C-alpha cells in the first residue's frame, strides 16, 4: 500500500517460522536482522552504517513474507539494533518511493 | 517523481548555498550531513545507527531543497560517512513508499 513517513516505515515480517517487526529502509543496501536462528550454510560477513561496522551471518535465499508478500533473497543477521529490509528485497515487493 | 530502489536512491540537494548528493533514506529518523560549513548557533547531540553512535551538530530551521522543493528542518552535520536526508524532511516533501 501507500505508506507515509510521520512514523517509522515499521512491518510485519515471517521469516524462518517466527514473526518479527522490521524497518523499510530504503538507505539500506541490506537486509540485516537481529540475532535469531535460522538454519542452513553461511559466509561471515562486515557491513557498516552511522557510527562504524558489525560482523554478520550471510544466508542467502532465505524465504521472507513482508507484509503480503513472499520473496527469497540474502538476509544478514548480526547485531544490529533493529531489523532493517534493505534495497534487496524492497525491490522484490515492487517497493517505490514518491513524491 | 516515483523513484524505484534497483539502485541507490540519491538525488541533488541545496543547503547553505552548495549542492551535493544525499541518500533518501526511510529508515533515518534524522537529516546528517557530511561535514560541512553552516551558518548559526547549535547544540551537541550524539546519534546513533548499525555500527555504534557518532557525536554530530544540530541547526535548526535550515533551508535545504530537495530536488524541486525547499523545506526548512534540522539538519545534523557530523561524521557521517555519506549525507542521509531522513524523514524529518522526507515528510516535509510529501514522500511515501508504495508497493
Ligand atoms: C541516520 C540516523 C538518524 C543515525 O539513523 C540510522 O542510522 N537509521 C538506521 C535505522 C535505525 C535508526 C534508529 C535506531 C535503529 C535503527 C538505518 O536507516 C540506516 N540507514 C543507512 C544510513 C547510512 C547509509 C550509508 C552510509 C551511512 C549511513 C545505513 O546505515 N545503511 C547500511 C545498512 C547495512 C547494510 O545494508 O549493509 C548500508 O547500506 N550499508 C552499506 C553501505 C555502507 C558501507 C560502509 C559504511 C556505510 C555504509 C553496506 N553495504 O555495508
Known amino acids: 500500500p501507500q505508506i507515509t513517513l510521520w512514523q517509522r ?3 510485519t515480517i515471517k ?3 517466527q514473526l518479527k517487526e522490521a524497518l523499510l529502509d530504503t538507505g539500506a543496501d541490506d537486509t540485516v ?3 535469531m ?3 542452513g550454510r553461511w ?3 562486515m557491513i557498516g552504517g552511522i ?3 558489525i560482523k554478520v551471518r550471510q544466508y542467502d535465499q532465505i524465504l521472507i513474507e513482508i507484509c503480503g508478500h513472499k ?3 540474502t538476509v544478514l543477521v548480526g547485531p544490529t539494533p533493529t531489523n532493517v ?3 534487496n528485497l524492497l525491490t522484490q515487493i515492487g517497493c517505490t518511493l514518491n513524491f
Do not use: A, H, T, Y
Request: charged residues 20%.
Open 9 to 11: 516505515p515499521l512491518v
Open 15 to 17: 521469516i524462518g517460522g
Open 33 to 35: 536482522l537481529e540475532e
Open 37 to 39: 536462528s535460522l538454519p
Open 43 to 45: 559466509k561471515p560477513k
Open 51 to 53: 557510527g562504524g561496522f
Open 71 to 73: 520473496v527469497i533473497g
Open 85 to 87: 529490509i534493505g534495497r
